[PDB]
Amino acid sequence: ECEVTLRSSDTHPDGYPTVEGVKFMAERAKELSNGRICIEVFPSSQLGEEKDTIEQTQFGVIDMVRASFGSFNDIVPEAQLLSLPYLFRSEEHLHNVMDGPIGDELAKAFEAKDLIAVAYYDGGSRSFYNSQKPITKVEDLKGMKFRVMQSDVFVDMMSALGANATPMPYGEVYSSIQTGVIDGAENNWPSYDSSGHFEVAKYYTLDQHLMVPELVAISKIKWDALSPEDQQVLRQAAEESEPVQRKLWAEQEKASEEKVVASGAEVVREIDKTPFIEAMAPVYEKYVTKSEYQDLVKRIQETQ
Ligand SMILES: O=C(O)[C@H]1O[C@@H](O)[C@H](O)[C@@H](O)[C@@H]1O
């Protein structure tokens, strides 16, 4: 048994939808391989913060990782491109993009950087939360200090809004907010909840400026050393976990919103997003640098 073992990393805790997703993938891969293939999940950043685990996965030290496109920065340039603000209209839109040929194009981009993309997971939309004041309009962000994920595109996004970005690993955000070093950060409801940030940043504004895709990626080095039979099992188990993870995600979006609101989170709803969207013009100008990227963005916006 467990002749083929794979260590899989996630920054999130046990019980979180992405972790439950890979745990389901692991149960299925074990069943389908008659006990041969054994995926072990290491949650809560046990093996390191997310960007660091991505690099260790590329080197084959970690076998598999569940990660946000936003943690890649320049490592996979099209991953950064798909982290542009207000690129996707909805979770349905994003599903149709990632499920179609654009998803295959991105898979090729990951493979060129020694990562085999076997599933795309849902991460919903990200919105601003802070400890200082309600954000009711773009102008309220002026001069404020917000953590972002470690990609240049998010630093530029904050500058476009007249604020100051500070990239840092997810695990350090809570203390930085708590001690007042930064004013806030931005994320989806389940992160805002499970991270504890709602305890130290009670103001949340549903500006929904990002929908950053996520993936399960296997080390290409480890993958290439597997038999075709074992590769087939992994891909099957990964694809099976996708609809499952999507449903777990939808349920947790609801539960976490309810939870944090029950705890006193002060939420601003119905914000006019138009000025937020307009402000992103320079960001698109800076990152949409080609034909290859221009047409990509175009085909995304054209996807129903
Ligand atoms: O802000 C972050 O770093 C985290 O945001 C969450 O939404 C992602 O699911 C996670 O992969 C990122 O590490």
PDB file of C-alpha atoms and ligand atoms in Angstrom:
ATOM      1  CA  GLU A   1       0.000   0.000   0.000  1.00  0.00           C
ATOM      2  CA  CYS A   2       0.935   3.662  -0.590  1.00  0.00           C
ATOM      3  CA  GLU A   3       3.755   2.774  -2.940  1.00  0.00           C
ATOM      4  CA  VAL A   4       3.232   6.206  -4.467  1.00  0.00           C
ATOM      5  CA  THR A   5       3.036   8.920  -1.815  1.00  0.00           C
ATOM      6  CA  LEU A   6       2.428  12.611  -2.582  1.00  0.00           C
ATOM      7  CA  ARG A   7       2.661  15.411  -0.048  1.00  0.00           C
ATOM      8  CA  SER A   8       0.131  18.156  -0.826  1.00  0.00           C
ATOM      9  CA  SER A   9       0.265  21.663   0.667  1.00  0.00           C
ATOM     10  CA  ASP A  10      -2.441  24.162   1.430  1.00  0.00           C
ATOM     11  CA  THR A  11      -2.253  27.471   3.332  1.00  0.00           C
ATOM     12  CA  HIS A  12      -5.822  27.006   4.642  1.00  0.00           C
ATOM     13  CA  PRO A  13      -6.939  24.960   7.687  1.00  0.00           C
ATOM     14  CA  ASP A  14      -8.609  21.556   7.783  1.00  0.00           C
ATOM     15  CA  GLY A  15     -12.284  21.905   6.947  1.00  0.00           C
ATOM     16  CA  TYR A  16     -11.744  24.704   4.406  1.00  0.00           C
ATOM     17  CA  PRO A  17     -13.235  23.903   0.923  1.00  0.00           C
ATOM     18  CA  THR A  18      -9.886  23.648  -0.929  1.00  0.00           C
ATOM     19  CA  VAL A  19      -8.516  21.263   1.713  1.00  0.00           C
ATOM     20  CA  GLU A  20     -11.691  19.147   1.695  1.00  0.00           C
ATOM     21  CA  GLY A  21     -11.426  19.134  -2.095  1.00  0.00           C
ATOM     22  CA  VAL A  22      -7.945  17.667  -2.133  1.00  0.00           C
ATOM     23  CA  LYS A  23      -8.854  15.236   0.640  1.00  0.00           C
ATOM     24  CA  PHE A  24     -11.653  13.974  -1.604  1.00  0.00           C
ATOM     25  CA  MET A  25      -9.197  13.741  -4.491  1.00  0.00           C
ATOM     26  CA  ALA A  26      -6.924  11.709  -2.198  1.00  0.00           C
ATOM     27  CA  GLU A  27      -9.711   9.274  -1.191  1.00  0.00           C
ATOM     28  CA  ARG A  28     -10.627   8.766  -4.820  1.00  0.00           C
ATOM     29  CA  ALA A  29      -7.057   8.359  -6.074  1.00  0.00           C
ATOM     30  CA  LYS A  30      -6.495   5.736  -3.395  1.00  0.00           C
ATOM     31  CA  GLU A  31      -9.712   3.884  -4.255  1.00  0.00           C
ATOM     32  CA  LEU A  32      -9.056   4.032  -7.996  1.00  0.00           C
ATOM     33  CA  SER A  33      -5.445   2.847  -7.634  1.00  0.00           C
ATOM     34  CA  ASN A  34      -6.420   0.009  -5.253  1.00  0.00           C
ATOM     35  CA  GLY A  35      -4.439   1.568  -2.394  1.00  0.00           C
ATOM     36  CA  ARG A  36      -1.293   2.323  -4.407  1.00  0.00           C
ATOM     37  CA  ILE A  37      -1.495   6.128  -4.588  1.00  0.00           C
ATOM     38  CA  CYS A  38      -1.594   7.962  -1.258  1.00  0.00           C
ATOM     39  CA  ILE A  39      -1.968  11.741  -1.151  1.00  0.00           C
ATOM     40  CA  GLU A  40      -1.264  13.296   2.262  1.00  0.00           C
ATOM     41  CA  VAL A  41      -2.541  16.822   2.815  1.00  0.00           C
ATOM     42  CA  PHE A  42      -0.544  19.293   4.847  1.00  0.00           C
ATOM     43  CA  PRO A  43      -2.883  22.159   5.738  1.00  0.00           C
ATOM     44  CA  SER A  44      -2.375  25.410   7.570  1.00  0.00           C
ATOM     45  CA  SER A  45       0.911  26.249   5.826  1.00  0.00           C
ATOM     46  CA  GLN A  46       2.694  23.466   7.730  1.00  0.00           C
ATOM     47  CA  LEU A  47       5.142  23.142   4.862  1.00  0.00           C
ATOM     48  CA  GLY A  48       5.533  26.908   4.384  1.00  0.00           C
ATOM     49  CA  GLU A  49       3.630  29.978   3.181  1.00  0.00           C
ATOM     50  CA  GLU A  50       2.027  29.644  -0.236  1.00  0.00           C
ATOM     51  CA  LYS A  51       4.588  31.266  -2.583  1.00  0.00           C
ATOM     52  CA  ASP A  52       7.379  29.355  -0.918  1.00  0.00           C
ATOM     53  CA  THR A  53       5.438  26.047  -1.385  1.00  0.00           C
ATOM     54  CA  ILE A  54       4.894  26.864  -5.070  1.00  0.00           C
ATOM     55  CA  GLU A  55       8.658  27.144  -5.532  1.00  0.00           C
ATOM     56  CA  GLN A  56       9.271  23.942  -3.551  1.00  0.00           C
ATOM     57  CA  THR A  57       6.707  22.170  -5.738  1.00  0.00           C
ATOM     58  CA  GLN A  58       8.518  23.341  -8.881  1.00  0.00           C
ATOM     59  CA  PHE A  59      11.696  21.771  -7.420  1.00  0.00           C
ATOM     60  CA  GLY A  60       9.903  18.537  -6.545  1.00  0.00           C
ATOM     61  CA  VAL A  61      10.393  18.902  -2.822  1.00  0.00           C
ATOM     62  CA  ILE A  62       6.643  19.185  -2.313  1.00  0.00           C
ATOM     63  CA  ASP A  63       4.661  16.951  -4.676  1.00  0.00           C
ATOM     64  CA  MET A  64       1.453  18.939  -5.016  1.00  0.00           C
ATOM     65  CA  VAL A  65       0.040  22.345  -4.053  1.00  0.00           C
ATOM     66  CA  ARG A  66      -3.345  24.051  -4.004  1.00  0.00           C
ATOM     67  CA  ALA A  67      -2.653  27.720  -4.732  1.00  0.00           C
ATOM     68  CA  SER A  68      -4.075  31.034  -5.856  1.00  0.00           C
ATOM     69  CA  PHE A  69      -2.971  32.427  -9.221  1.00  0.00           C
ATOM     70  CA  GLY A  70      -2.175  35.557  -7.220  1.00  0.00           C
ATOM     71  CA  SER A  71       0.712  33.957  -5.342  1.00  0.00           C
ATOM     72  CA  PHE A  72       2.729  33.308  -8.552  1.00  0.00           C
ATOM     73  CA  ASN A  73       3.653  36.851  -9.496  1.00  0.00           C
ATOM     74  CA  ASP A  74       6.048  36.530 -12.424  1.00  0.00           C
ATOM     75  CA  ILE A  75       6.625  32.813 -12.071  1.00  0.00           C
ATOM     76  CA  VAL A  76       3.762  32.121 -14.534  1.00  0.00           C
ATOM     77  CA  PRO A  77       3.029  35.374 -16.377  1.00  0.00           C
ATOM     78  CA  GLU A  78      -0.428  34.401 -17.676  1.00  0.00           C
ATOM     79  CA  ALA A  79      -1.441  33.530 -14.095  1.00  0.00           C
ATOM     80  CA  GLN A  80      -0.801  37.180 -13.216  1.00  0.00           C
ATOM     81  CA  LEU A  81      -2.732  38.283 -16.249  1.00  0.00           C
ATOM     82  CA  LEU A  82      -5.773  36.342 -15.064  1.00  0.00           C
ATOM     83  CA  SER A  83      -5.478  38.123 -11.695  1.00  0.00           C
ATOM     84  CA  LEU A  84      -6.372  41.502 -13.208  1.00  0.00           C
ATOM     85  CA  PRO A  85      -9.039  43.411 -11.316  1.00  0.00           C
ATOM     86  CA  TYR A  86     -12.626  43.288 -12.610  1.00  0.00           C
ATOM     87  CA  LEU A  87     -11.626  40.785 -15.304  1.00  0.00           C
ATOM     88  CA  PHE A  88     -14.397  38.286 -14.516  1.00  0.00           C
ATOM     89  CA  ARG A  89     -18.083  39.187 -14.160  1.00  0.00           C
ATOM     90  CA  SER A  90     -19.098  36.304 -11.908  1.00  0.00           C
ATOM     91  CA  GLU A  91     -18.232  32.814 -10.695  1.00  0.00           C
ATOM     92  CA  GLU A  92     -20.240  31.397 -13.652  1.00  0.00           C
ATOM     93  CA  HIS A  93     -18.220  33.460 -16.106  1.00  0.00           C
ATOM     94  CA  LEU A  94     -14.997  32.293 -14.545  1.00  0.00           C
ATOM     95  CA  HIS A  95     -16.185  28.641 -14.614  1.00  0.00           C
ATOM     96  CA  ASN A  96     -16.901  28.885 -18.344  1.00  0.00           C
ATOM     97  CA  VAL A  97     -13.508  30.420 -18.982  1.00  0.00           C
ATOM     98  CA  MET A  98     -11.474  27.919 -16.970  1.00  0.00           C
ATOM     99  CA  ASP A  99     -13.538  24.921 -18.172  1.00  0.00           C
ATOM    100  CA  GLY A 100     -12.958  25.785 -21.836  1.00  0.00           C
ATOM    101  CA  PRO A 101      -9.891  26.224 -24.045  1.00  0.00           C
ATOM    102  CA  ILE A 102      -8.530  29.173 -22.045  1.00  0.00           C
ATOM    103  CA  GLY A 103      -8.153  26.745 -19.133  1.00  0.00           C
ATOM    104  CA  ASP A 104      -6.110  24.492 -21.436  1.00  0.00           C
ATOM    105  CA  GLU A 105      -3.980  27.430 -22.509  1.00  0.00           C
ATOM    106  CA  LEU A 106      -3.238  28.271 -18.885  1.00  0.00           C
ATOM    107  CA  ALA A 107      -2.412  24.602 -18.229  1.00  0.00           C
ATOM    108  CA  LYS A 108       0.254  24.846 -20.917  1.00  0.00           C
ATOM    109  CA  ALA A 109       1.627  27.975 -19.220  1.00  0.00           C
ATOM    110  CA  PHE A 110       1.968  26.127 -15.914  1.00  0.00           C
ATOM    111  CA  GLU A 111       3.614  23.126 -17.558  1.00  0.00           C
ATOM    112  CA  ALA A 112       6.305  25.369 -19.043  1.00  0.00           C
ATOM    113  CA  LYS A 113       7.161  26.275 -15.447  1.00  0.00           C
ATOM    114  CA  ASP A 114       7.284  22.677 -14.140  1.00  0.00           C
ATOM    115  CA  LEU A 115       3.749  22.460 -12.775  1.00  0.00           C
ATOM    116  CA  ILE A 116       0.985  20.154 -13.955  1.00  0.00           C
ATOM    117  CA  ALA A 117      -2.447  21.738 -13.476  1.00  0.00           C
ATOM    118  CA  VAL A 118      -4.978  18.996 -12.724  1.00  0.00           C
ATOM    119  CA  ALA A 119      -7.898  21.011 -11.377  1.00  0.00           C
ATOM    120  CA  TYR A 120      -9.175  24.571 -11.061  1.00  0.00           C
ATOM    121  CA  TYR A 121     -10.849  25.459  -7.754  1.00  0.00           C
ATOM    122  CA  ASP A 122     -13.208  28.289  -6.833  1.00  0.00           C
ATOM    123  CA  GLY A 123     -12.079  31.258  -4.767  1.00  0.00           C
ATOM    124  CA  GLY A 124     -15.008  33.645  -5.259  1.00  0.00           C
ATOM    125  CA  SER A 125     -14.465  37.419  -5.250  1.00  0.00           C
ATOM    126  CA  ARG A 126     -12.202  39.518  -3.048  1.00  0.00           C
ATOM    127  CA  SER A 127     -13.232  42.707  -1.218  1.00  0.00           C
ATOM    128  CA  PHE A 128     -11.596  45.281   1.101  1.00  0.00           C
ATOM    129  CA  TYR A 129     -11.680  45.024   4.880  1.00  0.00           C
ATOM    130  CA  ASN A 130      -9.990  47.294   7.366  1.00  0.00           C
ATOM    131  CA  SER A 131      -9.750  48.358  10.995  1.00  0.00           C
ATOM    132  CA  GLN A 132      -9.952  52.140  10.554  1.00  0.00           C
ATOM    133  CA  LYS A 133     -13.199  53.226   8.831  1.00  0.00           C
ATOM    134  CA  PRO A 134     -16.016  52.220   6.490  1.00  0.00           C
ATOM    135  CA  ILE A 135     -15.106  52.401   2.816  1.00  0.00           C
ATOM    136  CA  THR A 136     -18.172  53.821   1.042  1.00  0.00           C
ATOM    137  CA  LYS A 137     -16.484  55.290  -2.031  1.00  0.00           C
ATOM    138  CA  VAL A 138     -13.079  55.070  -3.774  1.00  0.00           C
ATOM    139  CA  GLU A 139     -11.916  58.279  -2.171  1.00  0.00           C
ATOM    140  CA  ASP A 140     -12.067  56.632   1.254  1.00  0.00           C
ATOM    141  CA  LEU A 141      -9.051  54.485   0.333  1.00  0.00           C
ATOM    142  CA  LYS A 142      -6.729  57.465  -0.134  1.00  0.00           C
ATOM    143  CA  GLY A 143      -3.461  57.056   1.689  1.00  0.00           C
ATOM    144  CA  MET A 144      -4.449  53.813   3.405  1.00  0.00           C
ATOM    145  CA  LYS A 145      -2.161  50.788   3.846  1.00  0.00           C
ATOM    146  CA  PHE A 146      -3.529  47.500   2.522  1.00  0.00           C
ATOM    147  CA  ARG A 147      -1.876  44.095   2.331  1.00  0.00           C
ATOM    148  CA  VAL A 148      -2.043  42.367  -0.998  1.00  0.00           C
ATOM    149  CA  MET A 149      -0.820  39.002  -2.273  1.00  0.00           C
ATOM    150  CA  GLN A 150       2.746  38.844  -3.546  1.00  0.00           C
ATOM    151  CA  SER A 151       2.210  39.861  -7.166  1.00  0.00           C
ATOM    152  CA  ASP A 152       3.132  43.202  -8.774  1.00  0.00           C
ATOM    153  CA  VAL A 153      -0.289  43.502 -10.359  1.00  0.00           C
ATOM    154  CA  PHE A 154      -1.880  44.023  -6.907  1.00  0.00           C
ATOM    155  CA  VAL A 155       0.658  46.690  -5.881  1.00  0.00           C
ATOM    156  CA  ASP A 156      -0.292  48.618  -9.010  1.00  0.00           C
ATOM    157  CA  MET A 157      -4.002  48.061  -8.291  1.00  0.00           C
ATOM    158  CA  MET A 158      -3.656  49.782  -4.930  1.00  0.00           C
ATOM    159  CA  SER A 159      -1.703  52.699  -6.441  1.00  0.00           C
ATOM    160  CA  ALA A 160      -4.485  53.147  -8.981  1.00  0.00           C
ATOM    161  CA  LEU A 161      -6.898  53.572  -6.061  1.00  0.00           C
ATOM    162  CA  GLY A 162      -4.629  56.076  -4.358  1.00  0.00           C
ATOM    163  CA  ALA A 163      -3.620  53.689  -1.594  1.00  0.00           C
ATOM    164  CA  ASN A 164      -0.408  51.981  -0.511  1.00  0.00           C
ATOM    165  CA  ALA A 165       0.088  48.261  -1.010  1.00  0.00           C
ATOM    166  CA  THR A 166       2.157  45.980   1.098  1.00  0.00           C
ATOM    167  CA  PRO A 167       2.694  42.472  -0.289  1.00  0.00           C
ATOM    168  CA  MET A 168       3.133  39.828   2.377  1.00  0.00           C
ATOM    169  CA  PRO A 169       2.348  36.146   2.990  1.00  0.00           C
ATOM    170  CA  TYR A 170      -1.192  35.336   4.116  1.00  0.00           C
ATOM    171  CA  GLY A 171      -0.113  34.047   7.549  1.00  0.00           C
ATOM    172  CA  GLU A 172       1.340  37.370   8.652  1.00  0.00           C
ATOM    173  CA  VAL A 173      -1.642  39.559   7.881  1.00  0.00           C
ATOM    174  CA  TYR A 174      -3.534  39.084  11.154  1.00  0.00           C
ATOM    175  CA  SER A 175      -0.737  40.424  13.362  1.00  0.00           C
ATOM    176  CA  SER A 176       0.075  43.269  10.964  1.00  0.00           C
ATOM    177  CA  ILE A 177      -3.564  44.440  11.132  1.00  0.00           C
ATOM    178  CA  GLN A 178      -3.758  43.821  14.893  1.00  0.00           C
ATOM    179  CA  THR A 179      -0.642  45.851  15.696  1.00  0.00           C
ATOM    180  CA  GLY A 180      -1.709  48.632  13.327  1.00  0.00           C
ATOM    181  CA  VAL A 181       1.169  48.311  10.927  1.00  0.00           C
ATOM    182  CA  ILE A 182      -1.285  48.021   8.036  1.00  0.00           C
ATOM    183  CA  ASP A 183      -4.891  49.227   7.928  1.00  0.00           C
ATOM    184  CA  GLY A 184      -6.393  46.157   6.250  1.00  0.00           C
ATOM    185  CA  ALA A 185      -6.371  43.642   3.448  1.00  0.00           C
ATOM    186  CA  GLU A 186      -8.741  42.073   0.934  1.00  0.00           C
ATOM    187  CA  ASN A 187     -10.238  38.630   0.458  1.00  0.00           C
ATOM    188  CA  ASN A 188     -13.302  36.435   0.056  1.00  0.00           C
ATOM    189  CA  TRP A 189     -15.706  35.687   2.903  1.00  0.00           C
ATOM    190  CA  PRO A 190     -14.283  32.271   3.818  1.00  0.00           C
ATOM    191  CA  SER A 191     -10.735  33.709   4.142  1.00  0.00           C
ATOM    192  CA  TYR A 192     -11.908  36.768   6.042  1.00  0.00           C
ATOM    193  CA  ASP A 193     -13.553  34.306   8.478  1.00  0.00           C
ATOM    194  CA  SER A 194     -11.106  31.393   8.820  1.00  0.00           C
ATOM    195  CA  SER A 195      -8.045  33.654   9.023  1.00  0.00           C
ATOM    196  CA  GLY A 196      -9.495  35.573  11.948  1.00  0.00           C
ATOM    197  CA  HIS A 197      -9.083  38.888  10.125  1.00  0.00           C
ATOM    198  CA  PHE A 198     -12.758  39.719  10.911  1.00  0.00           C
ATOM    199  CA  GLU A 199     -11.710  39.885  14.607  1.00  0.00           C
ATOM    200  CA  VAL A 200      -9.262  42.685  13.954  1.00  0.00           C
ATOM    201  CA  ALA A 201     -10.754  44.371  10.884  1.00  0.00           C
ATOM    202  CA  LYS A 202     -14.500  44.794  11.341  1.00  0.00           C
ATOM    203  CA  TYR A 203     -15.220  46.986   8.332  1.00  0.00           C
ATOM    204  CA  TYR A 204     -15.881  45.081   5.050  1.00  0.00           C
ATOM    205  CA  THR A 205     -16.942  46.663   1.738  1.00  0.00           C
ATOM    206  CA  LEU A 206     -18.262  44.487  -1.059  1.00  0.00           C
ATOM    207  CA  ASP A 207     -16.363  46.129  -3.930  1.00  0.00           C
ATOM    208  CA  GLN A 208     -15.469  42.674  -5.369  1.00  0.00           C
ATOM    209  CA  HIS A 209     -12.410  44.023  -7.209  1.00  0.00           C
ATOM    210  CA  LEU A 210     -10.877  40.608  -7.903  1.00  0.00           C
ATOM    211  CA  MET A 211     -11.778  37.042  -8.775  1.00  0.00           C
ATOM    212  CA  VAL A 212      -8.445  35.257  -8.768  1.00  0.00           C
ATOM    213  CA  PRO A 213      -8.488  31.667 -10.129  1.00  0.00           C
ATOM    214  CA  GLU A 214      -6.959  28.804  -8.153  1.00  0.00           C
ATOM    215  CA  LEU A 215      -5.471  25.456  -9.075  1.00  0.00           C
ATOM    216  CA  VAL A 216      -4.259  22.110  -7.887  1.00  0.00           C
ATOM    217  CA  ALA A 217      -0.824  21.620  -9.431  1.00  0.00           C
ATOM    218  CA  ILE A 218       1.443  18.616  -9.305  1.00  0.00           C
ATOM    219  CA  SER A 219       5.267  18.861  -9.510  1.00  0.00           C
ATOM    220  CA  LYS A 220       6.175  18.081 -13.151  1.00  0.00           C
ATOM    221  CA  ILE A 221       9.279  16.341 -11.854  1.00  0.00           C
ATOM    222  CA  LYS A 222       7.185  14.026  -9.715  1.00  0.00           C
ATOM    223  CA  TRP A 223       4.540  13.633 -12.459  1.00  0.00           C
ATOM    224  CA  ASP A 224       7.061  12.604 -15.095  1.00  0.00           C
ATOM    225  CA  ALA A 225       8.342   9.847 -12.828  1.00  0.00           C
ATOM    226  CA  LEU A 226       4.834   8.321 -12.623  1.00  0.00           C
ATOM    227  CA  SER A 227       3.393   5.615 -14.840  1.00  0.00           C
ATOM    228  CA  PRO A 228       0.716   6.557 -17.379  1.00  0.00           C
ATOM    229  CA  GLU A 229      -1.701   4.480 -15.287  1.00  0.00           C
ATOM    230  CA  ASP A 230      -1.017   6.506 -12.142  1.00  0.00           C
ATOM    231  CA  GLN A 231      -1.190   9.788 -14.078  1.00  0.00           C
ATOM    232  CA  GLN A 232      -4.580   8.779 -15.338  1.00  0.00           C
ATOM    233  CA  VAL A 233      -5.812   8.029 -11.799  1.00  0.00           C
ATOM    234  CA  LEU A 234      -4.615  11.400 -10.479  1.00  0.00           C
ATOM    235  CA  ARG A 235      -6.208  13.373 -13.297  1.00  0.00           C
ATOM    236  CA  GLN A 236      -9.459  11.485 -12.840  1.00  0.00           C
ATOM    237  CA  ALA A 237      -9.498  12.016  -9.072  1.00  0.00           C
ATOM    238  CA  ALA A 238      -8.620  15.697  -9.534  1.00  0.00           C
ATOM    239  CA  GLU A 239     -11.400  16.263 -12.096  1.00  0.00           C
ATOM    240  CA  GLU A 240     -13.872  14.490  -9.833  1.00  0.00           C
ATOM    241  CA  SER A 241     -12.995  16.821  -6.967  1.00  0.00           C
ATOM    242  CA  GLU A 242     -13.757  19.960  -8.962  1.00  0.00           C
ATOM    243  CA  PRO A 243     -17.594  19.957  -8.807  1.00  0.00           C
ATOM    244  CA  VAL A 244     -17.332  18.841  -5.234  1.00  0.00           C
ATOM    245  CA  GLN A 245     -15.037  21.729  -4.299  1.00  0.00           C
ATOM    246  CA  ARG A 246     -17.320  24.182  -6.106  1.00  0.00           C
ATOM    247  CA  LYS A 247     -20.291  23.140  -3.993  1.00  0.00           C
ATOM    248  CA  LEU A 248     -18.291  23.187  -0.751  1.00  0.00           C
ATOM    249  CA  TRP A 249     -17.167  26.655  -1.732  1.00  0.00           C
ATOM    250  CA  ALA A 250     -20.693  27.925  -2.318  1.00  0.00           C
ATOM    251  CA  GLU A 251     -21.826  26.648   1.084  1.00  0.00           C
ATOM    252  CA  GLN A 252     -18.862  28.195   2.912  1.00  0.00           C
ATOM    253  CA  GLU A 253     -19.352  31.594   1.226  1.00  0.00           C
ATOM    254  CA  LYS A 254     -22.804  31.655   2.828  1.00  0.00           C
ATOM    255  CA  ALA A 255     -21.782  30.272   6.223  1.00  0.00           C
ATOM    256  CA  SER A 256     -18.784  32.592   6.615  1.00  0.00           C
ATOM    257  CA  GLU A 257     -20.726  35.700   5.686  1.00  0.00           C
ATOM    258  CA  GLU A 258     -23.378  34.738   8.262  1.00  0.00           C
ATOM    259  CA  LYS A 259     -20.741  33.981  10.850  1.00  0.00           C
ATOM    260  CA  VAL A 260     -18.833  37.255  10.560  1.00  0.00           C
ATOM    261  CA  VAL A 261     -21.969  39.367  10.379  1.00  0.00           C
ATOM    262  CA  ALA A 262     -23.213  37.565  13.537  1.00  0.00           C
ATOM    263  CA  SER A 263     -19.918  38.647  15.143  1.00  0.00           C
ATOM    264  CA  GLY A 264     -20.408  42.346  14.417  1.00  0.00           C
ATOM    265  CA  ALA A 265     -18.793  42.757  10.997  1.00  0.00           C
ATOM    266  CA  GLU A 266     -19.956  46.088   9.554  1.00  0.00           C
ATOM    267  CA  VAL A 267     -20.591  45.435   5.867  1.00  0.00           C
ATOM    268  CA  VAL A 268     -21.040  48.058   3.151  1.00  0.00           C
ATOM    269  CA  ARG A 269     -23.281  46.771   0.364  1.00  0.00           C
ATOM    270  CA  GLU A 270     -24.480  48.262  -2.903  1.00  0.00           C
ATOM    271  CA  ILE A 271     -21.330  50.249  -3.534  1.00  0.00           C
ATOM    272  CA  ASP A 272     -21.047  51.835  -6.975  1.00  0.00           C
ATOM    273  CA  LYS A 273     -18.192  49.884  -8.601  1.00  0.00           C
ATOM    274  CA  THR A 274     -17.900  52.153 -11.655  1.00  0.00           C
ATOM    275  CA  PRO A 275     -15.181  54.431 -10.213  1.00  0.00           C
ATOM    276  CA  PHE A 276     -13.267  51.385  -8.925  1.00  0.00           C
ATOM    277  CA  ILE A 277     -13.412  49.844 -12.374  1.00  0.00           C
ATOM    278  CA  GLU A 278     -12.399  53.042 -14.156  1.00  0.00           C
ATOM    279  CA  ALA A 279      -9.425  53.510 -11.868  1.00  0.00           C
ATOM    280  CA  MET A 280      -7.926  50.221 -13.170  1.00  0.00           C
ATOM    281  CA  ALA A 281      -7.161  51.579 -16.666  1.00  0.00           C
ATOM    282  CA  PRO A 282      -3.393  52.016 -15.911  1.00  0.00           C
ATOM    283  CA  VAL A 283      -3.167  48.542 -14.465  1.00  0.00           C
ATOM    284  CA  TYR A 284      -4.502  46.984 -17.642  1.00  0.00           C
ATOM    285  CA  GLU A 285      -2.214  49.216 -19.696  1.00  0.00           C
ATOM    286  CA  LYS A 286       0.794  47.990 -17.722  1.00  0.00           C
ATOM    287  CA  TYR A 287       0.110  44.232 -17.775  1.00  0.00           C
ATOM    288  CA  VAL A 288      -1.678  43.629 -21.084  1.00  0.00           C
ATOM    289  CA  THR A 289       1.596  43.915 -23.001  1.00  0.00           C
ATOM    290  CA  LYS A 290       1.089  41.937 -26.214  1.00  0.00           C
ATOM    291  CA  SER A 291      -1.002  40.282 -28.803  1.00  0.00           C
ATOM    292  CA  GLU A 292      -0.928  36.954 -26.866  1.00  0.00           C
ATOM    293  CA  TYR A 293      -2.204  38.656 -23.694  1.00  0.00           C
ATOM    294  CA  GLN A 294      -4.542  41.104 -25.466  1.00  0.00           C
ATOM    295  CA  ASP A 295      -6.439  38.392 -27.266  1.00  0.00           C
ATOM    296  CA  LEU A 296      -6.577  36.327 -24.102  1.00  0.00           C
ATOM    297  CA  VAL A 297      -8.251  39.200 -22.244  1.00  0.00           C
ATOM    298  CA  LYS A 298     -10.550  39.723 -25.212  1.00  0.00           C
ATOM    299  CA  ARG A 299     -11.676  36.069 -25.379  1.00  0.00           C
ATOM    300  CA  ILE A 300     -12.274  36.107 -21.622  1.00  0.00           C
ATOM    301  CA  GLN A 301     -14.544  39.155 -21.879  1.00  0.00           C
ATOM    302  CA  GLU A 302     -16.325  37.500 -24.824  1.00  0.00           C
ATOM    303  CA  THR A 303     -16.959  34.238 -22.961  1.00  0.00           C
ATOM    304  CA  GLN A 304     -20.537  33.933 -21.742  1.00  0.00           C
TER     305      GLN A 304
HETATM  306  O1  LIG B   1      -4.684  36.248   0.317  1.00  0.00           O
HETATM  307  C1  LIG B   1      -4.096  35.112   0.260  1.00  0.00           C
HETATM  308  O2  LIG B   1      -2.829  35.004   0.268  1.00  0.00           O
HETATM  309  C2  LIG B   1      -4.938  33.863   0.164  1.00  0.00           C
HETATM  310  O3  LIG B   1      -6.212  34.258  -0.417  1.00  0.00           O
HETATM  311  C3  LIG B   1      -7.143  33.116  -0.493  1.00  0.00           C
HETATM  312  O4  LIG B   1      -8.362  33.615  -0.994  1.00  0.00           O
HETATM  313  C4  LIG B   1      -6.540  32.039  -1.346  1.00  0.00           C
HETATM  314  O5  LIG B   1      -7.465  30.934  -1.390  1.00  0.00           O
HETATM  315  C5  LIG B   1      -5.224  31.615  -0.823  1.00  0.00           C
HETATM  316  O6  LIG B   1      -4.602  30.661  -1.683  1.00  0.00           O
HETATM  317  C6  LIG B   1      -4.293  32.780  -0.695  1.00  0.00           C
HETATM  318  O7  LIG B   1      -3.075  32.342  -0.061  1.00  0.00           O
END
